[PDB]
C-alpha cells in the first residue's frame, strides 16, 4: 500500500523546502496543543515527521473526524517555517482527505523518523 | 529532533503565528 503515499516528500520538504508539491501522506497521530492548534505526525511511507501543524481554518476536518489517525490525505497548500536552530515547521493550509481512517484501517508500510 | 513535550509544543504553536 506504500505505493499510495508520496515516498520521499518528507525528505524533499526538509531539504529543498519547496512548497509547490502536493504530496499524499498518511496521518499517524493528531494531538491538540493549547483554542487548539493540532500537531500531526505524518508519514510518506518512507519517513515520519511530527512538525506538521494544521492551520486553524482546517480545524473542522478534525472536529468532524474526516481527518483522523490512519487517514490518507493530499496536501494542496502548505508553508515551511525554518526555525533558528534549523528545524522546520510545516503548516498545512489546504488539504483533502482521500481515504478515510476507517477505510485504510492501519498504518501503511514501516516508516522511520526522518533523520 | 521533535518531541512530545511542552517546549516543542509551544515552539510549534508559536510558529503558526
Residue numbers in the entry:
A (entry chain A): 1 to 34, 39 to 119
B (entry chain B): 599 to 615
From the paper:
The heterotrimeric Replication protein A (RPA) is the ubiquitous eukaryotic single-stranded DNA (ssDNA) binding protein and participates in nearly all aspects of DNA metabolism, especially DNA damage response. The N-terminal OB domain of the RPA70 subunit (RPA70N) is a major protein-protein interaction element for RPA and binds to more than 20 partner proteins. The RPA70N domain adopts an OB fold with a five-stranded anti-parallel beta-barrel but has very weak ssDNA affinity. Its primary role is to mediate protein–protein interaction with its basic and hydrophobic groove and a side pocket, as first shown by a series of studies of RPA70N interacting with p53.
ETAA1 is a newly identified ATR activator that is able to promote restart of stalled replication forks to maintain genome integrity. ETAA1 is recruited to the DNA damage site via its two RPA-binding motifs (RBM): RBM1 interacts with RPA70N and RBM2 interacts with RPA32C. We fused RBM1 to RPA70N and crystallized the fusion protein in the P3221 space group. ETAA1 D606 and D607 interact with RPA70N R31, R43 and R91. ETAA1 W600, L609, L610, Y611 and A613 pack with hydrophobic residues (I33, M57, L87, V93 and I95) from the RPA70N basic groove. ITC titration showed that the affinity between ETAA1 RBM1 and RPA70N was relatively high among peptides tested in this study, with a KD of around 3.9 μM. ETAA1 W600A/L610A/Y611A triple mutation greatly reduced the affinity between ETAA1 RBM1 and RPA70N. Co-IP experiments showed reduced binding of the EGFP–ETAA1 W600A/L610A/Y611A triple mutant to RPA, and that mutation of the conserved arginine residues in RPA70N (R31, R41, R43, R91) disrupted the binding of RPA70N to the ETAA1 peptide.
